[model samples]
Target chain A: VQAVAVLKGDAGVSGVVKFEQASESEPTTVSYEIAGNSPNAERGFCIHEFGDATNGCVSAGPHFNPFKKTHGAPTDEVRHVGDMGNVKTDENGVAKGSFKDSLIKLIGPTSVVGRSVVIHAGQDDLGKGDTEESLKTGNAGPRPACGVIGLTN
Target chain B: VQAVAVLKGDAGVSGVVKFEQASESEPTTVSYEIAGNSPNAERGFCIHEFGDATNGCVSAGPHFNPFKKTHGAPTDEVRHVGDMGNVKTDENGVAKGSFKDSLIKLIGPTSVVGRSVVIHAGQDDLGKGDTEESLKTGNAGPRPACGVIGLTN
Candidate 1:
């Protein structure tokens, strides 16, 4: 599956996120490359609950946490599936990265398809901080970009 | 072909529009029904140039005036193919209506499919008013609702 992010709210961030299906013993590879984001900055990234980008990225809703778990690192066993942590941009305002995860499925009720990807204005604390927002959103600020996940050949 | 309207700008309007191909000599029948709109109010309606609703209805761009004609009634020969005019809501804030048009085609450069339908906050003057705004938008106010046309079985 693949998704293309459209920048919103003048955040000037845009990118594409791709999810590749994996074998039972292998983790799915989630890759992304973004441009025009803040230079040398960390931005919160996640798969949101809704695919409706009607009201900019805000309409994408909150993190895609079907397990009802608290926000945490992408490697945490009990964290939200959407807790992919942050992506850092370079001096040219571009970010490219990839990660492996075991929780996401492309063919189940928890499928990421029909969901949304959102880029926030602040860093995700990875549930390691003391604030209550950390438990919910890792203190990720306003959503500046969003996109809907769709199937690809 | 069919389109589903998703309300925008907090205007609380939503609906779906359907277009069916008619005989070679007959105009296509454009039908629509919207809910959560202003009661007993008239709203300008048209097919926009773009199907991208990521930034709300405004992002869909202006009316789909491929012929560069002035705003006029759906039956007028000199009007834009998109100029379907106003839709009136009932006291309960629901509007259901349909119209026939000679210019709209399901298979061609002027196809309504892959485009969008926009409902304005004001009435369309059908190119009969004297003002310039009337000549362009028929004095239609803000776009309160929008939808993208899609294929149907």
Candidate 2:
């Protein structure tokens, strides 16, 4: 099993995309820690599915909830499959958060360690619960920024 | 109040985001969800926070949990103010999840509607019960993707 760390700032980020595999004994756990401030506290930031140079890399996708659950309200006991976690903002415009999804599979066969980490310009509603399932999660908005998650390995 | 609907296949969406406000009369319950599929089926996506072009945006300051509870799992019947929720993956690389927080303010002047949402490229450990605070709640991984939340109004 292996580990990697990715950090982003105003212009870009700093980190290494290490490689590893997912397994039963040692599953991969990619974690991170962010501490900084955003320029547009209203617009916020997000991780995109796709990495785009234009549109500020706004073409990624929703939060990556493979579980199919709704968005937002991470405190809830039940949620979507991909509803890994979230990031928060403050009144002053400073925000910092992190995550550790199985996407990196340190023990399994497939690993996303050296893949890419994209940042969006918008925030994740997590889910917009109007129906029986959409409550709490983000309803979706626009993308504002993006970045790539690579590994040092 | 305004209502918005976000699909899974938007122009820049790799997944989906979901969430709802407390309404105009209440501020005790915060709802949310996440739905999408990722490349790493075993390791799904998590949540995180960061900064972008928007100033004072990242200042929302992590999940809003005044209680300092772990991620994904609520604190016994009492949840933290910063809890966003959780997600789980299936065989099809898709996971679904949801949750509600008593401490969260859904509607009213103190609502958390206009907050930011961030998506990470990793998964949340759900406070692995090994450290001081389990740490599973805050172990989703790295910031792979992200977004924000706002009232449709």
Candidate 3:
């Protein structure tokens, strides 16, 4: 199965991410190309509960933590399914990379399709910060960009 | 209460629509300024069930008929809350207008926050055509543009 999301933000942020999976038991390849960020920046990236991008990404809600667990590292077994960790930009303010993930899916219970992918202005602490928001959002500041995950034919 | 949606299509269609309501008992002002459509053309516009735009806006789902009623005109009393009828673009391929709606809400049970607004390629039949899709999707062809609604501060 395959899916994708095209993102946009008011401040020159625009990009797209593609998701592909061979089966429910296999890992999905998450690939993306996002631009229009600050140069040499570390941006927090994650999937959120809603695809809603109404109020500057506020209504998109918190990180996609379907397991009802505290925020943790992307590699942590105790983390939210929406947690993909962070992506760093280059001098041109762009982040481009790909990885294989086992927890997120195109089908089944933890589907990211229809959920949202957010790009924050600040870096995610990966639940390492000491504040309450750290465990919930990794201290990822305001979302500068976001888009809904969708099924692609 | 207020909400808004920003739409984008793969075919250069992009625009923003804003929703404003003072109370649940009052009509909400649905204002929009959508550009990049065919000049002088009328388009199919409505709210779909999901904000999932995965498969070319296909996963956004059908018209949001929580009442499970057949497709009908925007003015019809039995119409789905999503049925906003059609908006006509000017010579510049832009549809700019505003109207007050009583059925759609920004708050309460039938709230539209987080749902998606779709701009179809063709004109909406408004359930007046003599076909199955007519009553189901108003025979509105492919969706060229769509976006999720969200709450505003």
Candidate 4:
């Protein structure tokens, strides 16, 4: 599956996120290439609940959490399925990274297809902070960019 | 038909747009109510060609110009069906206005349903400017808000 990001607000951020299924015993490989983000800054990222981008990224709503879990790091056993954590950028305002995860699926009820990805203006605390916002949103700031996940062959 | 605006960027703009059959001999009445807009500002507005908000309002594409007409005022006879002109906000950043147009249909080849509406960041030139941009998009700036038109009754 692949998703193309669109810049919103004044962040000038845009990119493409791709997810591919590995083997049955391996985690899915998620890769991304984002341009125009803040240089050497941390940007929070997540899979939102809805695929709609009509209200910019906000219309996509909060993180996807069918299990009603709190926001946590992508590596946590108990965390929002959308919580994939943050991505770091280079001095050229570009972000390129990849990770493996088992939470996201391409097919089935919990599939990440037809959902959305949002990039935030601030860093995510990975649900380790003491604030209530941390437990819910990881204290991610404004959504500066977004995209809807689409199937690819 | 009804449509609900999704706020975009940091503009904080959101609204609901409605289209209804007024009378057998009269044109369709289009009404809208927007909140969280910039106070005392005029915003460019129009119906876009696509309903897919996958990449924010930009994915919605340009104005719904099935007839391939140039951008013109809503009151102009030779104009894009999607061109509904601008809406003005009050001192409190609220906008409420209505207009009637004969080119739009609710159930026909020229139907406006299933399309999308977009709110612009700047004013539309109404095809009266001296540049080529005026003929294409009326010089409307970036799309900051959008909504899909849906059948309500």
| DockQ of each two-chain model | 0.06, 0.02, 0.14, 0.05
Proportion of native contacts kept per candidate: 0.03, 0.00, 0.10, 0.01
Best candidate per TM-score, number?
3
* lDDT scores in order: 0.72, 0.38, 0.82, 0.75
Clashing pairs in 1: none
Model 1: residue B48 alpha-carbon error in angstroms:
18
lDDT (Cα) of model 3: 0.82
Weakest 10 consecutive residues of candidate 2 chain A by summed lDDT: A107-116
Query: What are the runs in model 4 whose C-alpha is more than 4 Å off?
Result: A1-10, A22-26, B1-153
Chain A only TM-scores, each candidate in turn: 0.90, 0.49, 0.95, 0.90
In terms of lDDT, which candidate is strongest? 3
Which ranges in model 1 have alpha carbons more than 4 Å from their true place?
A: A1-9, A22-26, B1-153
Better of 2 and 4 by TM-score: 4
Q: Number of the top candidate by DockQ? A: 3
What stretches of model 2 exceed 4 Å from their correct place?
A: A1-153, B1-13, B21-61, B67-72, B75-79, B97-99, B108-110, B132-137
Q: What RMSD does each model have against the real structure?
A: 10.7, 19.9, 7.0, 9.2
List TM-scores for all candidates, in order.
0.53, 0.36, 0.62, 0.51
- The better candidate by TM-score, 1 or 2, is 1
lDDT by residue (A16-80, candidate 3, tens digit) is: 88788989999989998999988898888898886656556777788887779998887998898
lDDT per residue for candidate 3 within B1-153, as digits (tens), equals 777788877888888888889999999899988989999998998988766554557777888887989898878988888999899999999999989998888767677765688988889999999988888988878889987675443
Per-residue lDDT for A72-135 in model 4, tens only?
9998988998898989989998889898888876544566655677888889999998999998
lDDT of 1 by residue, A1-153 (tens): 332233345667777777777454456688888887878999888888765545566666778888899999887877898778899989998879888788865545566654677788888889889988889999988887766554333
